Design a protein around this ligand. Structure first.
Ligand SMILES: [Zn+2]
Ligand SMILES: [Zn+2]
Ligand SMILES: [Zn+2]
Length: 173
């Protein structure tokens, strides 16, 4: 209602749950009504099963899929003031994962926040992946790209955990 933020988890273990848990706690302390919406499960409405999503995509019913996601979004965010949307991890088996992430963010008019893990990267290698990730969601054109997490309420209030100088995106938390 007041702020829709979609977390794009760009890694098989980037601590997406830790980020969401921190947002739940920050909002509860401020009395802000928060809904965490996970449109699709990653193997008033549960996350859609991946096999159901694949069946709708297989049968050329992507429109039906998006309608169901939008309907579930509304059933799950009634009277929410902040909505945190949990996106899909791009895994080996699913070539539709990142296109579905973009389509969901676009349809929900969500601000996009990428959740990364440093892993083995050097600082500059991580920043290269951050810039690559931003360009793949529209780059400088897409005004909804909001920031990156590496591990109307202000983002500092939403992502309070309490490379930010040279990062391609503002680093949150
Ligand atoms: Zn409390
Ligand atoms: Zn699958
Ligand atoms: Zn339709």
């Amino acid at each position: 209602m007041s702020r829709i933020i979609m977390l794009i988890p760009t890694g098989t273990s980037v601590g997406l749950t830790s980020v969401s848990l921190g947002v739940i706690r920050a909002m509860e302390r401020k009395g802000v009504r928060l809904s965490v919406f996970k449109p699709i499960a990653q193997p008033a409405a549960e996350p859609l099963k991946m096999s159901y999503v694949e069946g709708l995509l297989s049968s050329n019913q992507k429109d039906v899929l998006m309608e169901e996601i939008v309907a579930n979004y509304h059933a799950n965010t009634k009277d929410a003031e902040v909505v945190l949307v949990e996106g899909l991890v791009p895994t080996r088996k699913h070539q539709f994962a990142q296109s579905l992430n973009y389509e969901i963010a676009k349809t929900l008019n969500a601000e996009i926040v990428f959740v990364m893990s440093q892993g083995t990267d050097t600082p500059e290698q991580l920043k290269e992946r951050i810039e690559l990730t931003r360009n793949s969601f529209g780059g400088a054109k897409n005004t909804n790209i909001t920031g990156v997490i590496v591990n109307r309420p202000d983002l500092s209030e939403i992502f309070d955990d309490s490379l930010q100088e040279s990062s391609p995106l503002p680093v949150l938390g």
